[PDB]
Amino acid sequence: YSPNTQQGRTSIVHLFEWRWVDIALECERYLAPKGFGGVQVSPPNENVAIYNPFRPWWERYQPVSYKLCTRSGNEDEFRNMVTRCNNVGVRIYVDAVINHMCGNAVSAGTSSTCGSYFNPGSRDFPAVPYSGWDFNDGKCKTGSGDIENYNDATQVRDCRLTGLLDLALEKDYVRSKIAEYMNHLIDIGVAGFRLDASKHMWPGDIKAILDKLHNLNSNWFPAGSKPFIYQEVIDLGGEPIKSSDYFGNGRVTEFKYGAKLGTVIRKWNGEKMSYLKNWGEGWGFMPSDRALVFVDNHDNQRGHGAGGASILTFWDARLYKMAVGFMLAHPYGFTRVMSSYRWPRQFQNGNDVNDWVGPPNNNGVIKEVTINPDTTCGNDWVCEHRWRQIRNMVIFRNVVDGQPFTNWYDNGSNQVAFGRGNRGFIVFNNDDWSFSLTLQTGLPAGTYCDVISGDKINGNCTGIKIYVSDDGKAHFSISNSAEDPFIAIHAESKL
Numbered sequence: 001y002s003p004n005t006q007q008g009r010t011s012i013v014h015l016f017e018w019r020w021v022d023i024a025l026e027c028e029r030y031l032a033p034k035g036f037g038g039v040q041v042s043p044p045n046e047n048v049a050i051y052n053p054f055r056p057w058w059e060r061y062q063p064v065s066y067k068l069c070t071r072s073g074n075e076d077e078f079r080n081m082v083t084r085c086n087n088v089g090v091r092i093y094v095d096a097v098i099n100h101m102c103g104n105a106v107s108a109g110t111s112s113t114c115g116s117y118f119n120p121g122s123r124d125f126p127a128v129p130y131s132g133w134d135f136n137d138g139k140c141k142t143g144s145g146d147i148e149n150y151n152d153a154t155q156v157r158d159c160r161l162t163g164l165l166d167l168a169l170e171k172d173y174v175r176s177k178i179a180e181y182m183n184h185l186i187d188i189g190v191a192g193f194r195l196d197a198s199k200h201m202w203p204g205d206i207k208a209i210l211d212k213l214h215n216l217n218s219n220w221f222p223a224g225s226k227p228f229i230y231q232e233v234i235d236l237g238g239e240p241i242k243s244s245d246y247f248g249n250g251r252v253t254e255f256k257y258g259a260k261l262g263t264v265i266r267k268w269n270g271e272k273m274s275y276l277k278n279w280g281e282g283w284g285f286m287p288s289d290r291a292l293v294f295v296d297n298h299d300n301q302r303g304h305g306a307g308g309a310s311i312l313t314f315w316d317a318r319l320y321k322m323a324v325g326f327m328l329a330h331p332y333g334f335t336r337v338m339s340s341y342r343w344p345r346q347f348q349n350g351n352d353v354n355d356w357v358g359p360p361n362n363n364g365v366i367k368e369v370t371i372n373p374d375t376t377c378g379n380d381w382v383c384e385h386r387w388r389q390i391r392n393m394v395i396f397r398n399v400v401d402g403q404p405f406t407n408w409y410d411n412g413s414n415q416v417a418f419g420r421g422n423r424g425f426i427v428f429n430n431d432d433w434s435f436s437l438t439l440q441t442g443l444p445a446g447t448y449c450d451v452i453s454g455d456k457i458n459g460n461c462t463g464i465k466i467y468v469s470d471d472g473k474a475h476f477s478i479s480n481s482a483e484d485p486f487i488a489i490h491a492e493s494k495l
């Protein structure tokens with residue numbers, strides 16, 4: 001349940017589709033000094049090379065083998081990345097796709113990221129190796145062999161998720177091959193795993209697989225360290241399978257979080273920020289110590305999975321920064337920040353027909369992440385983690401770590417504020433009029449740099465300044481027209 005991040009680091013960033021060499025560099029030049037706790041990488045195992053559409057992002061969720069050979073790099077580069085990141089105190093979490101192999105209708109051949117041969121029709125994946133009796137063909141009871149009804153917990157676990165060849169996780173052999181892959185990653189130095197499609201696996205089979213895992217690499221982690229486990233389970237209520245069914249194995253993705261936040265911030269369905277004062281379990285969310293929270297993830301930012309129209313993304317930058325800001329400032333759950341790439345989003349009727357488009361590339365070769373002089377990224381990498389408003393809130397969360405949610409204020413609409421003990425205070429204005437009031441910050445007297453509009457550098461603030469009096473009060477003024485209608489100050493942004 002523990003992140004195993006370096007003491008004082010409270011967030012991980014999803015460097016979606018980034019190359020191992022770019023992540024290695026990013027850890028050293030940026031994540032370490034900016035206090036990021038770790039990085040969730042895209043599946044590092046060999047996958048199907050899909051040509052139609054052309055190299056979609058989702059081809060990485062169709063395993064061919066467990067060789068660490070993908071468009072992100074080979075094993076040497078993978079090991080290089082993990083070592084360089086651990087050496088500067090930044091952890092690596094692997095997106096483990098262990099519920100299945102490839103689409104059952106994909107053509108046989110060597111169209112894979114490492115050239116391994118595979119035959120879906122004959123359930124043949126010699127590079128692992130897996131054969132027909134390593135899949136749930138005989139176990140699934142649906143007419144199509146695919147998952148057709150989510151109200152039936154059994155088919156959800158024994159049948160094919162959109163046709164993906166379902167592994168027989170009950171078999172000790174399959175469990176062992178998977179554990180072999182995971183231990184390979186653990187011994188290399190990875191601190192944990194995002195268990196992909198966990199809802200589709202029996203909690204008892206997952207447990208069995210974890211039983212075979214090693215302790216974390218003792219060169220970097222203390223003896224007896226168990227790998228961090230967060231299972232992807234989309235549970236918005238209404239279905240028989242509940243997130244709580246996986247608490248025994250580790251943490252669980254809380255998809256209700258971003259869905260709710262998104263509609264509050266958009267002020268949809270009669271909601272407003274003032275309702276957020278009992279945010280967390282007060283809203284029906286799982287226990288804070290089991291929740292892996294986020295505003296958006298790689299699936300719902302592009303209409304996949306379960307997001308809905310309220311999900312906020314870099315596309316809605318202004319409201320997105322506010323949402324991520326609120327999350328990072330609130331004590332509930334363990335926070336994951338999304339880092340995406342841009343694609344030609346083109347809505348037709350209700351759907352983005354370019355939701356398949358993979359990462360920036362030149363004929364299949366992923367483009368490197370260029371860093372512009374102003375520290376933003378080029379080559380279409382959005383790099384939300386480098387946006388000042390988000391990067392500074394990541395540090396904000398580190399600074400107030402452990403402090404209690406306190407000093408809440410609200411105007412009964414969309415102008416709220418709250419503090420974290422005596423270490424941080426944040427103010428939001430999401431009403432269509434000006435927010436100007438003197439508030440109790442619970443902070444020691446002094447001059448603080450607003451970390452949203454600017455930074456603190458060698459004695460001065462580059463943005464807005466807030467003055468806290470001897471009684472902890474400070475005046476705040478946020479126009480409903482402000483570029484970023486929220487302000488944040490903390491112990492370490494103080495002059």
Ligand SMILES: OC[C@H]1O[C@H](O[C@H]2[C@H](O)[C@@H](O)[C@@H](O[C@H]3[C@H](O)[C@@H](O)[C@@H](O[C@H]4[C@H](O)[C@@H](O)[C@H](O)O[C@@H]4CO)O[C@@H]3CO)O[C@@H]2CO)[C@H](O)[C@@H](O)[C@@H]1O
Nearest residue numbers: 123124125126127128129130131132133134171172173174
């Ligand atoms: O030897 C040539 C073949 O090599 C590869 O075969 C591998 C299988 O694909 C893979 O599943 C695994 O096989 C083990 C079974 O998964 C495991 O359940 C058990 O099998 C039992 C079986 O359940 C039982 O009914 C049977 O009668 O006895 C088995 C034990 O002998 O152990 C299996 C063997 O370890 O490993 C296989 C060998 O690597 C290729 O996939 C295949 O195409 C080749 O023909």
Ligand SMILES: OC[C@H]1O[C@H](O[C@H]2[C@H](O)[C@@H](O)[C@H](O[C@H]3[C@H](O)[C@@H](O)[C@H](O)O[C@@H]3CO)O[C@@H]2CO)[C@H](O)[C@@H](O)[C@@H]1O
Nearest residue numbers: 139154157158168169170171201202203204205206208
């Ligand atoms: O609780 C008693 C009843 O349990 C049994 O129902 C079982 C199914 O038989 C069993 O297959 C299923 O659990 C397994 C998956 O089927 C399996 O392949 C995999 O290894 O993990 C699952 C659990 O880890 O679960 C149901 C419910 O327990 C049994 O069939 C009934 O007769 C018993 O009365």
Ligand SMILES: OC[C@H]1O[C@H](O)[C@H](O)[C@@H](O)[C@@H]1O
Nearest residue numbers: 317318376377382387388389
């Ligand atoms: O590229 C970085 C920039 O991206 C978006 O425009 C954000 O809204 C802005 O705050 C950020 O500085």
Ligand SMILES: *C(=O)[C@@H]1CCC(=O)N1
Nearest residue numbers: 001002226228229250
């Ligand atoms: C938590 O993420 C890990 C897996 C469960 C445990 O004890 N540690």
Ligand SMILES: [Ca+2]
Nearest residue numbers: 157166200201
């Ligand atoms: Ca399954």
Ligand SMILES: [Cl-]
Nearest residue numbers: 194232253297
């Ligand atoms: Cl996820």
